[PDB]
Amino acid sequence: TEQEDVLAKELEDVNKWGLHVFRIAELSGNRPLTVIMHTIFQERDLLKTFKIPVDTLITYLMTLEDHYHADVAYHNNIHAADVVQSTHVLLSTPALEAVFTDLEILAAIFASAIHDVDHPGVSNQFLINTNSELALMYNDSSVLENHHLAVGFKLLQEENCDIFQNLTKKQRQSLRKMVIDIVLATDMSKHMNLLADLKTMVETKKVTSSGVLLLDNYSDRIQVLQNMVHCADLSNPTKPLQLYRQWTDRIMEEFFRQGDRERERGMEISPMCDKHNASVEKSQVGFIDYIVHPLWETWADLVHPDAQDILDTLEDNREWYQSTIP
């Protein structure tokens, strides 16, 4: 109960950017995804709203969590938990108050939970280049992201795992489509097009009498949710530095392990995957400059000024990593 009370204490920070997610992973007995999802569902009253039996939720979450690979350094259950919690915070931004329905909120959070499930710790390109069963199944197109969806949905049909059992047929249909649209948008090959569309929305932005975003069609609604979960997926450099550095340690380990597999096969080693020739700090600065900051700056514009502190942290972290280079 002492460890249980300390875990309960930590989970009180679930509405905050910079939650101690690694501490939660250890305190929960390597069940960060389960406890964070359960906490968020309680916080948002989702069990009552969708008549989700508590035991069904926990059973599904435990099985979902099990299907993340404990031996993968970055794309594991802790990352899933982190993206879920980050999405949860982004959904609560003042500029979006009362914009999304309960079903849309459920879709975004569920999509976040399943978005990397059964990740093998290697990239789409590696899977394509090595003629893997996954690339063959999915015809080289969003290979992993299709797989994550397939696994996430299939696990609902396991014993006592259908958390959506009390949704209407129309609700289930809508949720399934939304979840697919969201998880496929986490494929980095879609990033530039997603960002271009987000910029267009920002430039043509409309707000209600309340000062909240006006979204009156599926296309705009789903686009915001896609970019939201994508922002959450790309949120590591916006977190307090002690968290960001741990995420960087993990992605580099994962990248280096892929590079070792490429080396052992006699393949050319992918960018940033050679442990004997890798500039970790320069690569983080490039990652921020070319990908993460352009996205988060546009998100910040969409919800201005709600995300200013997040954007400020990102800029501080870029400066920090940059400062280690000279």
Ligand SMILES: CC(C)CC(=O)c1ccc(OC(F)F)c(O[C@@H]2CCOC2)c1
């Ligand atoms: C979805 C995608 C961005 C996940 C990913 O590959 C990734 C996540 C966090 C990354 O870094 C840090 F945020 F943990 C990351 O960095 C690589 C290594 C240097 O630049 C690119 C990459």
Ligand SMILES: [Mg+2]
């Ligand atoms: Mg596992």
Ligand SMILES: [Mg+2]
């Ligand atoms: Mg992914």
Ligand SMILES: [Zn+2]
């Ligand atoms: Zn991810």
